[PDB]
Amino acid sequence: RARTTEAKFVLFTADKEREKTIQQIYQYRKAHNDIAEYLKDRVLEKTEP
Amino acid sequence: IITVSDTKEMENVMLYATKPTEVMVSFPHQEQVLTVTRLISAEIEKFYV
Amino acid sequence: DDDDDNVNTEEVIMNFSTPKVQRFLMSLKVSFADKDPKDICCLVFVERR
Amino acid sequence: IDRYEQVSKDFEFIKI
RNA sequence: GAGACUUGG
RNA sequence: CCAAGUCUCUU
């Protein structure tokens, strides 16, 4: 949604939840990387189920 | 699934897409609560019963 | 504390709120101190209705 | 208690 | 009104 | 058992 250039994104979490939330966000970012790279490298000729 | 994968396509996406800077705002989370909260909790409990 | 209901409103909001609310409104103030309303376009997301 | 705790003025938008 | 759907708990 | 949103559809 922050689709403009130099867009700023803000998050609020409790101090006690910092490690859990940052690990979760790393899970999310690595999942984005995984989906991107797996889609890129995965090559299927049939292109149809 | 299909999608763009080339770097020139990537920058073309960045023309209309953007990766906003993602930042955090941590806050100190406390557990103590005020007395009037207790009073209102008791009042609502009486109402519920 | 004082009689000026405007700054008193500010002060009580800072004081009668959880650190989460104080921190969020703090960030909101500092991010858009004296910018043109036209130049800014922001969203805030919350969970409950 | 009649009092909530404040929060300092010095926070920064730590990169996440 | 009936619910239905998705997600989560 | 709780929230959110959605959807068809009620006021």
Euclidean distance between CA atoms A4 and A26, whole angstroms? 23
Helices C5-15 & C19-31 angle (0-180, nearest 10):
130
How many Cα atoms are found within 13 Å in the side-chain-facing hemisphere of B22?
A: 9
Q: Which chains touch B (3 or more CB pairs under 8 A)?
A: A, C, D
- Using C1' positions and the CA of C49, the closest nucleotide is F4
Identify the burial level of B26 via C-beta atoms within 10 angstroms of its C-beta, where 0-12 means exposed, 13-18 middle and 19 or more buried. buried
Please give the span between the terminal C-alpha atoms of chain B, in angstroms, as a whole number. Answer: 56
Measured to protein CB atoms, the chain F nucleotides within 7 Å are 3-5
The answer to whether A26 contacts chain D (CB < 8 Å) is no
**What is the spatial distance between Cα C35 and Cα C23, in angstroms, rounded to a whole number?**
20
Q: How far apart are CA C36 and CA B33, in angstroms?
A: 39
Cα maximum dimension of chain A: 50
SS3 (DSSP) at A12: strand
CA angle A17, D2, B48 (to 5 degrees): 80
